[PDB]
Amino acid sequence: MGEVIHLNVGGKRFSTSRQTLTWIPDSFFSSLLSTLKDETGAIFIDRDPTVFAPILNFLRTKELDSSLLHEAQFYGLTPLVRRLQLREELDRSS
């Protein structure tokens, strides 16, 4: 049961599950999977992959581990955006 989704994000390859990409509703991925594919049949995402790895690992693990915030906003990853903004609030000295 389930579906394996292969992604090509600006030339860097990732493989994940449909579940991982769709637990956040109304996101970029929600729409994407409701498209452009490369030679290999992977879904192509025309974005810099530099911070995609930490985005993907958040979607997998539901825990964290700025450009990350900006990409999370682009992809419409609501809880990640929130937790990143609150991380900033936590650090405030004024």
Author numbering: 17 to 50, 55 to 85, 92 to 120
Structure paper excerpt:
The human KCTD family contains 25 soluble proteins that share a conserved potassium (K+) Channel Tetramerization Domain (a subtype of ‘BTB domain’) at their N-termini and have variable C-termini. The BTB fold of the Kv and KCTD families has a roughly pyramidal wedge shape and consists of five α-helices and a single β-sheet made from three β-strands. Overall, the pyramidal wedge shape of the KCTD family BTB domain creates a versatile scaffold compatible with a range of oligomeric assemblies and geometries that may impact function.
Mutations in another KCTD family member SHKBP1 [(SH3-Domain Kinase Binding Protein 1)-Binding Protein 1] have been identified in cervical cancer and acute myeloid leukaemia. This WD40 repeat-containing protein stabilizes EGFR by disrupting the c-Cbl-CIN85 complex. Overall, the BTB domains displayed a range of affinities from low-to-high nanomolar: KCTD17 (Kd = 7 nM) > KCTD5 (Kd = 55 nM) > SHKBP1 (Kd = 87 nM) > KCTD13 (Kd = 100 nM), KCTD10 (Kd = 460 nM). We observed that the monomeric SHKBP1 BTB domain was also stably incorporated into a 5 : 5 heterodecamer when mixed with Cul3 protein. Moreover, the SAXS data from this complex displayed an identical scattering curve to the KCTD17-Cul3 complex. This model is supported by cryo-EM studies and likely explains how Cul3 is able to ‘glue together’ SHKBP1 monomers into a 5 : 5 heterodecamer by forming contacts across the BTB interfaces. Unusually, the small CTD common to most KCTD family members is replaced in SHKBP1 by a large WD40 repeat domain, a substrate-binding domain also present in many F-box family E3 ligases, such as β-TrCP1. The BTB domain of SHKBP1 is the next closest paralogue in our study and is located in the phylogenetic tree between KCTD5 and KCTD9, the latter of which has also been crystallized as a closed pentamer.
